[PDB]
Amino acid sequence: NPEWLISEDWALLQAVKQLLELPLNLTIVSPAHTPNWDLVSDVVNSCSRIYRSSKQCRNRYENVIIPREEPLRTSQIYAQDENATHTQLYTSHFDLMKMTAGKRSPPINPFQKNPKHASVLAESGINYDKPLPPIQVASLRAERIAKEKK
Amino acid sequence: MTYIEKRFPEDLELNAQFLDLVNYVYRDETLSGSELTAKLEPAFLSGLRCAQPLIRAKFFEVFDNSMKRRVYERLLYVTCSQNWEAMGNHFWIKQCIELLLAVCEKSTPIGTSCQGAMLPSITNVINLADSHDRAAFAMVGNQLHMLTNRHDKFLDTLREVKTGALLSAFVQLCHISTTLAEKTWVQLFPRLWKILSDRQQHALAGEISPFLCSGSHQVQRDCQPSALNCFVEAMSQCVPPIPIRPCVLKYLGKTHNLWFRSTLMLEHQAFEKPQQEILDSLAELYSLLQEEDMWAGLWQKRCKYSETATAIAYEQHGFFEQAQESYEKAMDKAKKEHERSNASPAIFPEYQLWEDHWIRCSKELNQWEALTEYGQSKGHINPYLVLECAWRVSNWTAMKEALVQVEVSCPKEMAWKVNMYRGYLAICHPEEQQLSFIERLVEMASSLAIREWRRLPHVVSHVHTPLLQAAQQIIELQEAAQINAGLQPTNLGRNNSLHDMKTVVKTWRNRLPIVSDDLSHWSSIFMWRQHHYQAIVTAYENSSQHDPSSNNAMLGVHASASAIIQYGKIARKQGLVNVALDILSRIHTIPTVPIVDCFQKIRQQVKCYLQLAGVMGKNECMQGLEVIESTNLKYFTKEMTAEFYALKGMFLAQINKSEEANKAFSAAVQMHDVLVKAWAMWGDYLENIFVKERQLHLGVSAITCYLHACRHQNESKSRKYLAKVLWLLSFDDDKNTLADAVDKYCIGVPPIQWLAWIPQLLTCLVGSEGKLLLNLISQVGRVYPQAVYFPIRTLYLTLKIEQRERYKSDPGPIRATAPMWRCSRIMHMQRELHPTLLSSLEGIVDQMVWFRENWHEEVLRQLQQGLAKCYSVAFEKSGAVSDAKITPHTLNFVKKLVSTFGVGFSSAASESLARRAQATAQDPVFQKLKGQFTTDFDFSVPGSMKLHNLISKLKKWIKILEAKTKQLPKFFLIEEKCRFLSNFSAQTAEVEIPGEFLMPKPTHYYIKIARFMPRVEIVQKHNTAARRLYIRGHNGKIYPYLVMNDACLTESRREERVLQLLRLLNPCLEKRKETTKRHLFFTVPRVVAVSPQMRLVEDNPSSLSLVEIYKQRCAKKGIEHDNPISRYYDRLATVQARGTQASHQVLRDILKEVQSNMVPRSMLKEWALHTFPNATDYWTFRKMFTIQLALIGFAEFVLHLNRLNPEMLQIAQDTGKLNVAYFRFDINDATGDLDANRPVPFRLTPNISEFLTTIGVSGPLTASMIAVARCFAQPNFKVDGILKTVLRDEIIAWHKKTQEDTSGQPENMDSQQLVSLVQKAVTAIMTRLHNLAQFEGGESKVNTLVAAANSLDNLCRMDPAWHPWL
Amino acid sequence: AENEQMLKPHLHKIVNSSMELAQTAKEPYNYFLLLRALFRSIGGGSHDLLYQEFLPLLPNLLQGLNMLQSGLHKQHMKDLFVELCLTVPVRLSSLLPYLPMLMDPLVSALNGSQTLVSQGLRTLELCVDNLQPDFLYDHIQPVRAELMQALWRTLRNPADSISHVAYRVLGKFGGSNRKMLKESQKLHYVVTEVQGPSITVEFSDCKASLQLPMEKAIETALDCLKSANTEPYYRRQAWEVIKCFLVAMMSLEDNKHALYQLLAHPNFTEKTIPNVIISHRYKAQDTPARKTFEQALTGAFMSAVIKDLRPSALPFVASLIRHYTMVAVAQQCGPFLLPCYQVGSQPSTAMFHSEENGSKGMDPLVLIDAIAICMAYEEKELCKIGEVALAVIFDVASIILGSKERACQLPLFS
């Protein structure tokens, strides 16, 4: 799986912090406020990179956060360390790949009235040079229907 | 606790024993054991939710005593200290109801606070009336004494009932029923919140959100009535519940069945205005709801970079290539800005939008190779995109690696997607051909899809389209299973498997998705079919012995070619030519292909060239013509040559040559005279050259072409050609050449095709070309007697009524006119042919005449129309004087009204009704009323001629009459007077419901009237007391109808014409994308005119109007609905009192004050909120309202219809459909042309915009308007012909009306004036339609149109009677 | 082989006789059972001998079965009709000109019981597999909203196989499974703003009180008291709810001496009764309170029929009917006359409880509506309690007024 961005990591930390529970033991007084791992998962995968929020990752990366939170703190690494340069560089790479893909994509009066298209019609028995008015064509159709009926 | 209940659920004996054991453990010896209770919580909960009442009672009695008897303490307990995880898919909120109702006091008398519904006691009559009456009554056998004693004993027995007996039984009843108990919590929790003080409410609201999450309380995720759903509904239904996080709201909406409730809450937060998270979550949830329009509007409101708005506008209307280009430009500009300096983190959502929408666009544009190269990038592999776009290019190794990478991290919503991809892998992998687990994968995928379906709202919508599409590919995978099972060498060549393969291929060929689906799904289906088509082809190449006839490989080749051609056709229909050329270049790379499908490929190519030849260039069109001429025609058939020459003539008529095109059309029609399209296009070209050169020898030819094209084809297609035919009849000369032409070649055309145009040919029935049209209408009527009887009945009666006024000087009977005799001879012939059916129809019509009700509602409607006309004329005198005198016409109207005041075939029903009217006219009440009115309605006194004085007197009399007419019957039995209707039965005659033959249906299942229901109700609609008639059919369903008395034979006939126009335009909306995708359709009720004064219209019981809702809200507030107009006019008068003519600021401040004082813009919004308490129902109603309002606004703007007054708009509460009260073209009576140029294009008053919450307007409303504009703008539909055909008779009636005032020779208007006026009128609509259809640069004028529709600078100038505030 | 020759000559006879006789029979149930057995026997196996004689019977048989299943009938009768009309022993090859008559019962089978929905889905799959999609779509076009709505509702069925086959047939439909529905789906809505009846509950811990609406509660009570699947104790709880609702929605402010002095007046037995006519033709739409009252009254009348609830429901019902008729005769007769019952009055809305002014107090005439809806109930055993109610009304009216012929002039009887 792709590496975790510090932005989505701080987002996960805040989502866990917004569950009204402490990391010392994730079932605090008012035990009905058990940890909603699916909620923080939904809140995290809305970040820059791909979903990457299965049942495992949500617990694994929080258990990784706990040691380094109990070095710089996640909130400090978010406010510090080029706050928005990481996600912006990721998105710039994405846009560069987009442009490369879109660029390499493929771009995508000899009058000839040959005598074949007219010869087939002549063989069919109809004159092409002389346009038969629709009235005579209708009369011919009626005569053909009459012949068929007899 | 763990196993006894799992392995022995049915044997309730040991379960009850174990529950009694744990209850004893909890009850007795508590001082000794209190740690054991920790682990046995699931046992206690299960015993509490058991189905046995005694166990539940003994468990609740111990669960209640453990807590203080205080509502706040129990609420806090159940909200933060109690864990419901151990419950297990249970509706535990009923236990909350138990706990909250048990703490209530149950040692006091029972009572109720509903004083309005209190039942009076026996002795309550001792204090109601005055005193002395009862005082004298109080100072005034055994059979009665015993009764009184027993009754007093019984009453004493009742007074012993306490409130505790009610609550216990209420709770025991809520136990068994999950439904109607969720509602009890929803309705009781806010009541508890109301009594909680601020200190308690603050903490409770602050701790509810942790409880809304509550971690592992997710087993309810699959519960149909999930507990979190009810809890959040109740919490939101409170008054002060401000604090709730939008992220948790979106999570609950997605996971639990809270989609529409969550969206409503989020938008209610958003429209109250650190804070961008609300809009972010709302946009995410809208994109999750598949509601493209709302998402697009929200983002256009959020769009920072201008390129994003254009990209979203392009992608919203199917412009995928331009959308992709705009997205590329946008992200390039963003990359440049980033290289300049870092941007705020709030822009990341826009970047994700660009990413995913560029991915989607490239997916729609058949860029699978580019998508694979992108998702497979070394640094940022996107495994989901790769898994999606890998199998469509046969990259099975990449697909397998992406699958194994996704199966571990796939969203649970995409479980069925992962199953389908696993099946694709197992079926199509070269080195992993293991066809052992196939049906199991399909079963698991179907189960997961159904489980996801159970998580979606109950009202089907765009949210459910993904699963409805997935079903088809799942059943195809199931079929592919046996396909591959039969292609193996063990079964290869076997007839039993060959027949199954042939059948499955035929079914696939005959089973197709709909155009409303995106090209992505069409590709996902066709490419999946192509793999197995090729497998069939390849499988029959190494088994030359098996089936040695070169047929089964040809079968697969033909299947693949047909699938490719169908995919290209679908891509073309959606508006993609480049992908069409790509697919054509693809299909060209085959060793050999059939000759039948190559002709269809060439046909699709020439169709692409056709639809691309709108602004064709010389070079490109000549190259296309050369490519056309380069095709060989040696091994082809004959009819294909006819179609080819027809398309050639079309493409060359597109260019301004017109000679070789005529030759090619003639040659094609001679090659195959049965080819309908060729002859239709030839007739189109002939009509064009006739209208241009005006040669008589061409009109007959054009009409013959149209008729021969309409002969052998379906009516849906032939409609626009009959339209062209009917319009050409306005060019005939004195010799009536084209008349005899159409009369000579009409034998052969189906008679059903003329049903949709009976009114058009009836107007020509009165012209100099009569006799032949009479013969034709009689011939077509021999098959449909009623469809021709009703219209001729109405027209004959109208002609008789008109002649009665033309011969005012001659008393008694008079000689009939030529059209009268002409249309009555046909009725005589019909009665001779269909005597029973016509006699039953006559009986029905003569019985419904009894619906002439009385003088009360008659004079009420008369004075209502009088007040309406008074206001309409006063608006004209508003700005000038506003102290104006009544006009002569209005004076004559009111005089005639107050003089008649209600009393104004050889049949006997009319005579009996007149006798009854003269009889009931002998009472003194109505005589005294007439006297009092005449002593006031006289105008011969000074000071009463003022228009506003008349308006005030009319309002006074309106109030008096409405207070008088409130005591009348509301329904009557049909058997009282209508004997033939009550005695009507299916055995009498096979008569169909009125309005059935109007639109022909493919099937002949026409519901016949089984019998008329006995009850006939009276409903106040259209400012009149209409009579509602119910008719039942042989299917058991009931249809309601209103027998409306027009009282105006011209306005009703001009009104029911736009209904026919819309009904003709409705099919077209259903034949294009971006219209079916949005479910755009006109709601056109059925209206049939049975007589000049009466017409029968279809309706539904629950259909209010805007004015009805307004007056209902006013009565609720206790005010008069006529207050705002009177206030506007009072301000106008007081401003003009000092000579100053009211300026613009005057109107603006008047509107502002009347809106802020007595007409708040939030009236319709609160009305809708109260009407629809359910979030899903409210959302569906609002969406239907938005789309229907947009459609009718587009109609009333493009089509020059009268202003949509508020009382006209009918609003169906049961579906949300919006239909108006009979629009009509506002043709200028003076000039005779359409001049629909009001300040406001369509009704978008502040109340509506507030109901549409200001984003339904910017999104679905304008989106639907643009879609319907671009839809009708397509030339293939030829809506101009229908418009011309309708405007022909719309203007003929205008000319007839204008010439009647002065004074056969005058029976015909003119040979050149009528056509010129019709052409002038139709262009005014066509230009307005094209102006709206223009969508250059991702921008449209519809935005400026909707912006002007609600601008106060223009609304203030509208008519007060138009209610610019409602 | 041998018995098909003796049944063929009588097939048309028995079919037509059972069809024309059950129409005017006393218990037209065994005839439909016989028809179902005959259809099952003819369909079992490939006889190919009775098929020729049964073919000319579909034109009238199918029409009759459709007319039967379309009309209002008891649940079991409707189920039998829809199941015997769908399972016809005729191949689809010959049912083409008579296929349109099978969609109306199909949409009802899809909405019927588990067996009925299963049979309907079976027939739907049979017809979609054995026929071209285009013709089948043109066939279902008249009725598409109901069919699709039922197919979407049954998708949420608890039965796994039922939902699975529903999804399978929906996928078999193809793109037509999501085409635009002109007959848009219906959605629930409220018609009035006035609040329905409620019970007052108090809280002594916070010195406050609440209002408990009980419209849907009374609805649930009536629903669970009507159905036969409910258990006895739940029926008893619903009866208790209805009883407390009835007793809580009245004044209960009557005295013994005051009642005796009120009913013991010469005017009640000497003064002429005003001959005004009561007619629901002037009655407005039912308000929430009135419909809840009707539901409670019919639930009480039903409990009076329930065997285990009769001992306590019948006496309470009789006494409540006595109360209602006594208050009615007291308000519409005697020296005290309401402004709408005086001499010369005419029918008006003042007699009924409506959202408008109407009457001053709750309309006691609602008792007649309850008896009417009870006697018109699907079960005929309820007519007994309606007759008992009418009997006690007439008896107590004649008692309070004497001269039985005189107590019939009351507008209550009108």
Ligand SMILES: O=P(O)(O)O[C@H]1[C@@H](OP(=O)(O)O)[C@@H](OP(=O)(O)O)[C@@H](OP(=O)(O)O)[C@@H](OP(=O)(O)O)[C@H]1OP(=O)(O)O
């Ligand atoms: O479906 P296609 O082959 O692409 O062409 C169709 C077809 O007309 P033709 O098949 O004769 O070209 C339609 O009618 P059906 O045959 O499907 O019934 C219909 O044409 P009508 O308007 O005559 O119904 C439609 O046209 P539209 O886009 O106006 O709905 C469209 O023709 P196009 O080539 O214009 O798509």
